[PDB]
């Protein structure tokens, strides 16, 4: 009986590297622990469908790739949004085949204006939808 | 077990229309969406949850609409209308209780309409059963 | 015995008062009532794993703070002058029997979408517990 979701928000303050996993260290949510706060990585453990999304707050151009795979890892899509001398809340979402053994994660870009603190946060979630 | 569940994004998008058309196929369990219309097609009778994210650089207003029995229902819409040439993310989403047959999409307003095209970021527009009947 | 499912709007041109609770006036889908149009709040009748999810169109400055059971989850914020954009965020919660969940705003609370644009917040049960 396969109950799988997290949900993790960017608590840590230091900027991000071009081609760096982005990590979400404060866990809120982790049933089956499948989602490592340590690396910002889900691994499939369960094959299936699943449904990930984030939103991430913003003090300036952000572009973030969502990557999949076992021990390589690819681009699915990215996800660019914009901004000039402004605060902003972006979002992205996809529903992705899992094959076992594969990661997601959110991967860095050299936009990476990306905030995470109380009154202005950044989660990434991601939940089973059917297994199989 | 009744697993629909897809996503779509744009790529080489055929254009016309105010149907916003995700040519990309990612994910499309029972393959209840076709890439050429822009529409999904209920066969399971349920709740389903549909969203999208889709990116512009000017003015974009966007709508989740369904049909049943061919009839077409008009619902809420989301825009962003920055208007500056730089990327903007428009986001919406929606529960919707279907019956077979039902058909969802999205579409543009036709006075406001830009969807980036190119290379360098991506368009989503994502659906999934949450539970039958 | 049961599923859990809603979609609620906000249908008004006046926008919430600063520091309080969003009221979504209006339903498109809400089919066990866990959503209370009269409170603004949903109430947890079966206990397990749920997403909520918003997308709130604004004019002004706008910070969506999402509430479960008197605590502050995670709030998210938009600023833009004018011009119209969308604030959206969502998170996944275990909850038991009685809990409630809700938006607030704080005092960035505008919700003043241009025509066509419009506010939402929905929720629904993935894993009964
Ligand atoms: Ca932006």
Same mark, same amino acid.
């Given at each position: 009986?396969?109950?799988?979701?997290?949900? /993790?928000?960017?608590?840590?303050?230091?900027?991000?590297?071009?081609?760096?996993?982005?990590?979400?260290?404060?866990?809120?949510?982790?049933?089956?622990?499948?989602?490592?706060?340590?690396?910002?990585?889900? @691994?499939?453990?369960?094959?299936?469908?699943?449904?990930?999304?984030?939103?991430?707050?913003?003090?300036?151009?952000?572009?973030? &790739?969502?990557?999949?795979?076992?021990?390589?890892?690819?681009?699915?899509?990215?996800?660019?949004?914009?901004?000039?001398?402004?605060?902003?809340?972006?979002?992205?979402?996809?529903?992705?085949?899992?094959?076992?053994?594969?990661?997601?994660?959110?991967?860095?870009?050299?936009?990476?204006?990306?905030?995470?603190?109380?009154?202005?946060?950044?989660?990434?979630?991601?939940?089973?939808?059917?297994?199989? | 077990?009744?697993?629909? /569940?897809?996503?779509?994004?744009?790529?080489?998008?055929?254009?016309?229309?105010?149907?916003?058309?995700?040519?990309?196929?990612?994910?499309?369990?029972?393959?209840?969406?076709?890439?050429?219309?822009?529409?999904?097609?209920?066969?399971?009778?349920?709740?389903?949850?549909?969203?999208?994210?889709?990116?512009?650089?000017?003015?974009?207003?966007?709508?989740?609409? %369904?049909?049943?029995?061919?009839?077409?229902?008009?619902?809420?819409?989301?825009?962003?209308?920055?208007?500056?040439?730089?990327?903007?993310?428009?986001?919406?989403?929606?529960?919707?209780?279907?019956?077979?047959?039902?058909?969802?999409?999205?579409?543009?307003?036709?006075?406001?309409?830009?969807?980036?095209?190119?290379?360098?970021?991506?368009?989503?527009?994502?659906?999934?059963?949450?539970?039958?009947? | 015995?049961?599923?859990?499912?809603?979609?609620? @709007?906000?249908?008004?041109?006046?926008?919430? /008062?600063?520091?309080?609770?969003?009221?979504?006036?209006?339903?498109?889908?809400?089919?066990?009532?866990?959503?209370?149009?009269?409170?603004?709040?949903?109430?947890?009748?079966?206990?397990?794993?749920?997403?909520?999810?918003?997308?709130?169109?604004?004019? /002004? &400055?706008?910070?969506?703070?999402?509430?479960? %059971?008197?605590?502050?989850?995670?709030?998210?914020?938009?600023?833009?002058?004018?011009?119209?954009?969308?604030?959206?965020?969502?998170?996944?919660?275990?909850?038991?029997?009685?809990?409630?969940?809700?938006?607030?705003? &704080?005092?960035?609370?505008?919700?003043?979408?241009?025509?066509?644009?419009? %506010?939402?917040?929905?929720?629904?049960?993935?894993?009964?517990?």
């Amino acid at each position: 009986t396969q109950k799988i979701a997290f949900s /993790a928000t960017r608590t840590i303050n230091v900027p991000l590297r071009r081609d760096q996993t982005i990590r979400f260290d404060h866990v809120i949510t982790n049933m089956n622990n499948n989602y490592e706060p340590r690396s910002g990585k889900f @691994t499939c453990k369960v094959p299936g469908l699943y449904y990930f999304t984030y939103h991430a707050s913003s003090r300036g151009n952000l572009c973030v &790739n969502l990557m999949r795979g076992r021990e390589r890892a690819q681009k699915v899509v990215t996800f660019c949004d914009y901004a000039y001398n402004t605060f902003q809340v972006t979002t992205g979402g996809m529903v992705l085949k899992l094959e076992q053994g594969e990661n997601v994660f959110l991967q860095a870009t050299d936009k990476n204006s990306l905030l995470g603190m109380e009154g202005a946060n950044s989660i990434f979630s991601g939940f089973l939808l059917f297994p199989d | 077990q009744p697993r629909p /569940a897809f996503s779509a994004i744009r790529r080489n998008p055929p254009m016309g229309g105010n149907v916003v058309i995700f040519d990309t196929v990612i994910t499309n369990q029972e393959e209840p969406y076709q890439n050429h219309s822009g529409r999904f097609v209920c066969t399971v009778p349920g709740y389903y949850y549909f969203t999208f994210q889709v990116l512009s650089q000017w003015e974009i207003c966007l709508s989740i609409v %369904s049909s049943s029995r061919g009839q077409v229902r008009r619902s809420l819409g989301f825009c962003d209308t920055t208007n500056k040439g730089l990327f903007q993310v428009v986001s919406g989403g929606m529960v919707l209780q279907l019956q077979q047959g039902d058909q969802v999409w999205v579409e543009k307003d036709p006075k406001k309409g830009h969807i980036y095209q190119g290379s360098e970021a991506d368009s989503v527009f994502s659906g999934f059963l949450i539970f039958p009947s | 015995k049961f599923q859990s499912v809603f979609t609620v @709007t906000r249908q008004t041109h006046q926008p919430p /008062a600063p520091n309080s609770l969003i009221r979504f006036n209006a339903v498109l889908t809400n089919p066990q009532g866990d959503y209370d149009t009269s409170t603004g709040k949903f109430t947890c009748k079966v206990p397990g794993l749920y997403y909520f999810v918003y997308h709130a169109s604004h004019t /002004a &400055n706008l910070c969506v703070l999402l509430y479960r %059971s008197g605590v502050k989850v995670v709030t998210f914020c938009g600023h833009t002058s004018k011009t119209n954009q969308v604030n959206s965020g969502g998170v996944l919660l275990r909850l038991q029997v009685g809990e409630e969940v809700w938006l607030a705003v &704080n005092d960035y609370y505008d919700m003043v979408g241009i025509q066509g644009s419009d %506010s939402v917040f929905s929720g629904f049960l993935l894993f009964p517990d």
